[PDB]
PDB file of C-alpha atoms in Angstrom:
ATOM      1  CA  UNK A   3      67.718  22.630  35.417  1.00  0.00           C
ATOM      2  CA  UNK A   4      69.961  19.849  35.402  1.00  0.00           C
ATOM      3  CA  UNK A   5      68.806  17.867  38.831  1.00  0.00           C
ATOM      4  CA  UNK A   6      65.687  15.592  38.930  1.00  0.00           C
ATOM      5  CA  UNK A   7      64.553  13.888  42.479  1.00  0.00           C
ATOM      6  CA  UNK A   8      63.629  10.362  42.057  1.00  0.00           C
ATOM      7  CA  UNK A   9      62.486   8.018  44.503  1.00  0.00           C
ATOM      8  CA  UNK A  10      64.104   5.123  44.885  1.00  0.00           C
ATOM      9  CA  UNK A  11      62.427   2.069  46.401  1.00  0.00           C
ATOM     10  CA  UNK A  12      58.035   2.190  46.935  1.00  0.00           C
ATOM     11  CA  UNK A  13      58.281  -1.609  46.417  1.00  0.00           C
ATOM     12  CA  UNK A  14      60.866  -4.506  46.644  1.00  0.00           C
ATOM     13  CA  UNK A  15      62.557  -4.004  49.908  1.00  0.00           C
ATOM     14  CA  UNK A  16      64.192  -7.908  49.064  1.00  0.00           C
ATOM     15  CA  UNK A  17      66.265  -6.742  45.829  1.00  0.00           C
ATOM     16  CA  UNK A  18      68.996  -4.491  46.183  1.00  0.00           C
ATOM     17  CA  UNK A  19      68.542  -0.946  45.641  1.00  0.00           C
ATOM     18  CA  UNK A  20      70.524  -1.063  42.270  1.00  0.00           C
ATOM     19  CA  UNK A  21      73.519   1.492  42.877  1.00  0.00           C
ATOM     20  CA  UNK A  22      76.359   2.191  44.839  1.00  0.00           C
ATOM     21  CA  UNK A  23      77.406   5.968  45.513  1.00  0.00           C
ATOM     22  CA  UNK A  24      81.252   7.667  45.839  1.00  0.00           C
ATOM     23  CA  UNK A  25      82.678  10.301  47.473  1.00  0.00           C
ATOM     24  CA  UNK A  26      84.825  12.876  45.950  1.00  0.00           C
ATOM     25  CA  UNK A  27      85.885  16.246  46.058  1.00  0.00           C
ATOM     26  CA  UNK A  28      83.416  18.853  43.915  1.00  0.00           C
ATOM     27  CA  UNK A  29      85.202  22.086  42.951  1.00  0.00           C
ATOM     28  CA  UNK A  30      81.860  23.839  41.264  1.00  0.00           C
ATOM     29  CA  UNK A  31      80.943  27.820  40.476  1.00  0.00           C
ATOM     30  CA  UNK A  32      79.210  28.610  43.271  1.00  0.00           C
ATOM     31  CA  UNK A  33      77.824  31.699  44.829  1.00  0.00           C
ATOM     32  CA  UNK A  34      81.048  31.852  46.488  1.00  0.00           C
ATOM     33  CA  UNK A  35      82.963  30.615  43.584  1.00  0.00           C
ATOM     34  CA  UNK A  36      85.449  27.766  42.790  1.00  0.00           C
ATOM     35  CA  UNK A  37      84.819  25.531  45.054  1.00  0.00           C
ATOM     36  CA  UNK A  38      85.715  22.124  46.084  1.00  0.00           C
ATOM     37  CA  UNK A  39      83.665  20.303  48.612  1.00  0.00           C
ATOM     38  CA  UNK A  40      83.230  16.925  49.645  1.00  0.00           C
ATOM     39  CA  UNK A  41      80.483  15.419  47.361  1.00  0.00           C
ATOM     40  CA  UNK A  42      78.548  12.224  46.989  1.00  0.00           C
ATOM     41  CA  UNK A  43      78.219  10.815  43.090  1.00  0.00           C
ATOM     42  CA  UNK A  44      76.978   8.140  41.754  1.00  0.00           C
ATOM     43  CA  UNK A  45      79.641   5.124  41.713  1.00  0.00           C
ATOM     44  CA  UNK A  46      78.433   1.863  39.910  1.00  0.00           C
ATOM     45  CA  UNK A  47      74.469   1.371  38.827  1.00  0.00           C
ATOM     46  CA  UNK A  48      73.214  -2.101  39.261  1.00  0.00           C
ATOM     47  CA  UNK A  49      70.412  -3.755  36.474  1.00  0.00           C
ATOM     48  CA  UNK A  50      67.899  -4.770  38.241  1.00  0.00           C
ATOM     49  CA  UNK A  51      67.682  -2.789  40.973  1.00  0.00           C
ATOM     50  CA  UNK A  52      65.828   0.469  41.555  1.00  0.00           C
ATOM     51  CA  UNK A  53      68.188   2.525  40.563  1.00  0.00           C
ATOM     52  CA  UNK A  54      67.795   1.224  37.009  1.00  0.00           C
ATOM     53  CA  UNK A  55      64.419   0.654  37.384  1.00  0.00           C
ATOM     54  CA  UNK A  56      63.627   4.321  37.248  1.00  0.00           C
ATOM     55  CA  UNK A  57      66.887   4.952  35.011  1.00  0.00           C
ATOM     56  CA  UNK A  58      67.202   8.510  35.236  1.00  0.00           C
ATOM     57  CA  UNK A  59      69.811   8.474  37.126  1.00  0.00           C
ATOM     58  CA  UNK A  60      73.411   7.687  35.743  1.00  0.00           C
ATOM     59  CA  UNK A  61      77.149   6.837  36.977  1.00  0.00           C
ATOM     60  CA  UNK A  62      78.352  10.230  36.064  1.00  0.00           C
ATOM     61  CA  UNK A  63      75.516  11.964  37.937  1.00  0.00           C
ATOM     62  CA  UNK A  64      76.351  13.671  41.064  1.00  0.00           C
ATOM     63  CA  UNK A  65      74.131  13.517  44.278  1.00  0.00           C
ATOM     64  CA  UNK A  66      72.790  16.951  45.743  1.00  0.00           C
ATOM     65  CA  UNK A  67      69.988  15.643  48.660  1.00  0.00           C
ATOM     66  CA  UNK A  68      68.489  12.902  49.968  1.00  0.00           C
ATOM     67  CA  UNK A  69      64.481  12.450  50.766  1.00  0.00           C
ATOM     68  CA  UNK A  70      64.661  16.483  50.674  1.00  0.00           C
ATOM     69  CA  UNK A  71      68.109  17.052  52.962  1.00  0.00           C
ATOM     70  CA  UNK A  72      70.984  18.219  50.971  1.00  0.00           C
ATOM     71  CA  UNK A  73      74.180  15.790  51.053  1.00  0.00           C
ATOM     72  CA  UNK A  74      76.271  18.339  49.774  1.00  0.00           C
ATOM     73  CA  UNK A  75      78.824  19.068  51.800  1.00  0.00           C
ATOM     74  CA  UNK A  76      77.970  15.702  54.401  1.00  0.00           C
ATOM     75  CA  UNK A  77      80.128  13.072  55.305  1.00  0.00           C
ATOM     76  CA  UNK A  78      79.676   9.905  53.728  1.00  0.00           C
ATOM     77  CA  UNK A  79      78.134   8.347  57.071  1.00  0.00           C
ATOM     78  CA  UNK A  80      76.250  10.999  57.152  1.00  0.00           C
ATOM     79  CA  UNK A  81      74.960  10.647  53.724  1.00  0.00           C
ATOM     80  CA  UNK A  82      74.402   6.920  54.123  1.00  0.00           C
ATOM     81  CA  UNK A  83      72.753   7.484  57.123  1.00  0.00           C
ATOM     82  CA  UNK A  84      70.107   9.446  55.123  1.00  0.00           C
ATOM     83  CA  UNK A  85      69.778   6.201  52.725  1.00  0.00           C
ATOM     84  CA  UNK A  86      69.434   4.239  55.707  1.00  0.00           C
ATOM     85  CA  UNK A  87      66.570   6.131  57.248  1.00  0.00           C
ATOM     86  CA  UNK A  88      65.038   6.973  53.983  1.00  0.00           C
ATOM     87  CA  UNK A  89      64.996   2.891  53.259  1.00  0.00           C
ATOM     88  CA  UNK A  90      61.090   3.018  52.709  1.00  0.00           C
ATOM     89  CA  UNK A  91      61.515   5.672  50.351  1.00  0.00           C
ATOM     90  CA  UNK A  92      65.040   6.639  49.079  1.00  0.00           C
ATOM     91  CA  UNK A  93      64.524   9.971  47.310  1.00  0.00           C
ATOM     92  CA  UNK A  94      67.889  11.418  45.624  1.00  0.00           C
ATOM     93  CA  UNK A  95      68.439  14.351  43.948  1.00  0.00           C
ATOM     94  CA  UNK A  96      70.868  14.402  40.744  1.00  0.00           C
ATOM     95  CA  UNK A  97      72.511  16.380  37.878  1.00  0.00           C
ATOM     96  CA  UNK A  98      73.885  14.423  35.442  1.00  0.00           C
ATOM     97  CA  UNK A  99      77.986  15.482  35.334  1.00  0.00           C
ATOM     98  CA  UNK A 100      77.038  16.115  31.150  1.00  0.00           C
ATOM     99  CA  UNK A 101      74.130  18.040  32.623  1.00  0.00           C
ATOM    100  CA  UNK A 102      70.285  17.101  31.287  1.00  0.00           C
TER     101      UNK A 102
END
């Protein structure tokens, strides 16, 4: 299965947390079919941040949940809201766009 959760940020709340997300419209098969929905992806990964620091994650990669609670479908304030709260422990789920 394509998506991976990994935590972002147990240590080094001073450094940046090494990425920058996008939002774009996802059409995917889903259980309903084509679809195209408002989705958060990965937009620019920072060296030296967290992001990298755990380097599983990539540009291409598109975001599914945050810290457990899915993003798909969310606004993007409501998406950075989640990254906001989950600041002691930023936990994102995502498939890489040229899967795993």
């Amino acid at each position: 299965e394509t998506h991976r959760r990994v935590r972002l940020l147990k240590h080094g709340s001073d450094k940046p947390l090494g990425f920058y997300i996008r939002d774009g419209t996802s059409v995917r098969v889903t259980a309903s079919g084509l679809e195209k929905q408002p989705g958060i992806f990965i937009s620019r990964l920072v060296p030296g941040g967290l992001a990298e620091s755990t380097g599983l994650l990539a540009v291409n990669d598109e975001v599914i949940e945050v810290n457990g609670i899915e993003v798909a479908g969310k606004t993007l304030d409501q998406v950075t809201d989640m990254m906001v709260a989950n600041s002691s422990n930023l936990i994102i789920t995502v498939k890489p766009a040229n899967q795993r």
